[PDB]
Amino acid sequence: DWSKPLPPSERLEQELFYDDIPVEATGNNCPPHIESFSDVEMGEIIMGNIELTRYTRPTPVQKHAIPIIKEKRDLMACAQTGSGKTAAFLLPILSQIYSDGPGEALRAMKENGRYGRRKQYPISLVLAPTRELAVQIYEEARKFSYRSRVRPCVVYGGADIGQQIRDLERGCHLLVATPGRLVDMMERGKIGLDFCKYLVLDEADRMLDMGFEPQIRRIVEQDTMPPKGVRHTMMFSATFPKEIQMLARDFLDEYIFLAVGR
Numbered sequence: 001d002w003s004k005p006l007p008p009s010e011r012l013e014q015e016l017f018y019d020d021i022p023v024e025a026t027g028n029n030c031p032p033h034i035e036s037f038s039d040v041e042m043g044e045i046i047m048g049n050i051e052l053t054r055y056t057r058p059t060p061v062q063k064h065a066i067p068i069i070k071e072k073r074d075l076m077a078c079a080q081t082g083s084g085k086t087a088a089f090l091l092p093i094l095s096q097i098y099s100d101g102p103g104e105a106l107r108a109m110k111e112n113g114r115y116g117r118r119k120q121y122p123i124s125l126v127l128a129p130t131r132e133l134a135v136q137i138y139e140e141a142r143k144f145s146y147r148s149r150v151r152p153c154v155v156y157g158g159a160d161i162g163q164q165i166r167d168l169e170r171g172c173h174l175l176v177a178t179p180g181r182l183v184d185m186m187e188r189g190k191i192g193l194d195f196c197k198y199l200v201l202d203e204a205d206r207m208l209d210m211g212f213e214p215q216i217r218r219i220v221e222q223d224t225m226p227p228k229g230v231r232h233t234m235m236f237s238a239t240f241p242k243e244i245q246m247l248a249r250d251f252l253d254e255y256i257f258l259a260v261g262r
């Protein structure tokens with residue numbers, strides 16, 4: 001069902017569509033890396049969209065992070081920007097979702113709430129420090145969710161929350177958001193973190209530099225999100241100061257530390 005692609009759409013494909021660096025990797029029973037996307041199975045939809053995006057081979061961070069996430073192991077990864085981090089986590093996550101489906105849980109619930117008052121339960125949550133990074137992540141998600149049942153969404157401050165609220169209502173299996181706006185959404189009862197199995201923190205060090213830790217601890221520890229060990233968590237940070245080390249200690253479980261040249 002959720003594994004079978006939908007009929008193509010010329011209109012969308014229009015809209016939608018340095019290496020060999022040594023890597024450090026610490027942790028228990030760390031899953032082996034891939035040299036090509038076909039080394040592991042991610043389904044027709046993913047492989048189909050990888051072709052459309054013209055991704056020949058995985059980048060370094062993609063080579064080690066993808067199989068680790070596929071194996072449902074928590075991850076802490078220090079990689080520079082512009083290294084393919086985004087896809088490194090969206091491909092395996094989206095692949096997992098297509099394979100498993102939404103579940104009879106979120107399925108037998110697609111019809112709740114009232115007209116103009118629907119609560120959404122994202123299966124996946126991605127936190128970014130800025131509207132720019134959030135939008136990028138979001139665009140990459142649309143390309144990989146092309147011809148799939150997954151509907152990506154993105155919310156952030158600095159723009160009307162009204163339009164954003166109306167977009168969420170239409171459905172949201174994967175949510176990209178800046179911490180501030182997401183907290184707003186939750187207080188307004190528009191978002192529930194009860195079924196969130198995938199949590200990604202992109203550029204965590206940048207988020208703390210901006211003082212987003214309170215809102216993030218609020219989002220992850222002071223609410224309804226499944227705890228570590230149950231949910232699958234991934235952290236991406238270019239630097240690794242003590243604050244980030246502590247943030248990883250609290251949010252990650254028996255994780256793998258991945259350093260791509262830094």
Ligand SMILES: Nc1ncnc2c1ncn2[C@@H]1O[C@H](COP(=O)(O)OP(=O)(O)O)[C@@H](O)[C@H]1O
Pocket residue numbers: 054055056057058059062080081082083084085086087136
């Ligand atoms: N495996 C890949 N092969 C070829 N190009 C890629 C690959 N992964 C990402 N890119 C290119 O890099 C860009 C995305 O960079 P990005 O992943 O957003 O950096 P970051 O992860 O730090 O945000 C895309 O526009 C895409 O063309």
